[PDB]
Design a protein around this ligand. Structure first.
Ligand SMILES: [Au+]
Ligand SMILES: [Au+]
Ligand SMILES: [Au+]
Ligand SMILES: [Au+]
Lengths: 301, 301
């Protein structure tokens, strides 16, 4: 019993973190096989970030301008290239600690673990969600750029995120490991606002099922509802629309608990319209939306 | 910016987790140097847990009855002994992955990371607190006994907790790595209730300081208060009494923010007497108490 926001064990990723320096700028890189991946704004001064021409800044750099240090040892850089918003630094030594791995581009609402790093050194690990507006609400102090997000499937690490930017609102933006930003953000220090931060409905439902499984049942009511009727309520409260695909993903949790998905939607509707009346669910006074249905099953199993 | 409950990077601990089997019972062990540490109730049947005589059950076991597997390899057991509530299994091979480490017995209110494991395999990592009543609110499914809690200081891992029991209330109890239980609990499947679960006042204050540093300021008010006056309020709301030692530990956060500790106590008093009026602090609708002052400084630095 008990329900906690758990991150994946970080060891496989710790062994890939390196330090990358170019001129006066230092951040984190990811060393896999003989390639080091890092945010391209490693080549920018604090002044260049207003309006960088990355292609022009990059021509002024040669292989020997990129310093790459794994722990207390220097890697030799034998090639460099820019792929979208990431730099790929070819080194002459394959990382002996490279796990089995994949690069994946995740969908909004999916969760992953972040290994927050500074100067190539692991600081902490936490679990979060890609928001529907493609931001993450993270913990990134100066220097944590290049820290990565991942999921682990048995022995294979699926890297899905690299931290690049803090937006003026305090939320974080970054890319997949091919260097494509999640959402409309760009690697420039300019006014970019996030759209509306909606709640991930299918995750709240999964978390409500977790609550039932762990004994918190007070919020279950005697009503049911329909998809269209619930979705009118969802729209009002800035919740993501619920689809039949989402109902299907919740199937195993419905089966485990014997609570129909639409019954749970009607419980959720009443919590949205009534609040919690000073009560809690799984120790929380708010509706939690950073557990996917797969997470809940994983943690309960 | 941003504030998240972060666990320590788990890699140094992942490399120490092993599987320990004795008869039909399997749980997790911790392999450091040439000793494997695990809960002594590995020698119990599900039936023995009603009322075990551990000394009598242990005489029926010899070195070869303890199966210890690190990944897919078997360790050779050359000695066994019982130290309080843990078994120490002497093996013939030192763990090549042993980090620099210490055994420490933590105080109530201190935090640590847990690496939840099953059958010797790491499942997830999360940060929690030793409650003032010496329980932890964890995530432990069948088989996670022997999972451990730790803090990391640079390169040294301070092991402070081993999971042993789930109490009938759903909270968790365990020992230090010398096998002494935290609190009054025993390793027997019997009625043991936890005392009153009070809130860790100095941690709430630290978290309120974190909130100020990250821009959430609405709860700051125009009042101040005294230690004795605040502590009357603390007693009413089942908060731990605040001492001058606690005021002192908060000193650096007071300095950073320019908010006197007693000013922040008066903010806390009003939140305790008024609630949050449907507002949030650092994304939470409740007062968070599982960040120590040291955590807050660490994460902000
Ligand atoms: Au793979
Ligand atoms: Au940065
Ligand atoms: Au040490
Ligand atoms: Au167990």
């Amino acid at each position: 019993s008990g329900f906690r926001k758990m991150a994946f064990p970080s060891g496989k990723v710790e062994g890939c973190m390196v330090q990358v320096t170019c001129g006066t700028t230092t951040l984190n890189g990811l060393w896999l096989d003989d390639v080091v991946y890092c945010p391209r704004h490693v080549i920018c001064t604090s002044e260049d970030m207003l309006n960088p021409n990355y292609e022009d800044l990059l021509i002024r750099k040669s292989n020997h301008n990129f310093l790459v240090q794994a722990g207390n040892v220097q890697l030799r850089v034998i090639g460099h290239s820019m792929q979208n918003c990431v730099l790929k630094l070819k080194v002459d030594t394959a990382n002996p600690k490279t796990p089995k791995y994949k690069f994946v581009r995740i969908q909004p609402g999916q969760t992953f673990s972040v290994l927050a790093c500074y100067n190539g050194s692991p600081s902490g690990v936490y679990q979060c969600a890609m928001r529907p507006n493609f931001t993450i609400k993270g913990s990134f102090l100066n220097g944590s750029c290049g820290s990565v997000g991942f999921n682990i499937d048995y022995d294979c690490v699926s890297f899905c995120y690299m931290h690049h930017m803090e937006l003026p609102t305090g939320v974080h933006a970054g890319t997949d490991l091919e260097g494509n930003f999640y959402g409309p953000f760009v690697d420039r220090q300019t006014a970019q606002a996030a759209g509306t931060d909606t709640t991930i409905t299918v995750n709240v439902l999964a978390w409500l099922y977790a609550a039932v499984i762990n004994g918190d049942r007070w919020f279950l009511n005697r009503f049911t509802t329909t998809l269209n009727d619930f979705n009118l309520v969802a729209m009002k409260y800035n919740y993501e629309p619920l689809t039949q695909d989402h109902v299907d993903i919740l199937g195993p949790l419905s089966a485990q608990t014997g609570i129909a998905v639409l019954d749970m939607c009607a419980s959720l509707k009443e919590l949205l319209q009534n609040g919690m009346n000073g009560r809690t669910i799984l120790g929380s006074a708010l509706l939690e939306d950073e557990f996917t249905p797969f997470d809940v099953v994983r943690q309960c199993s």
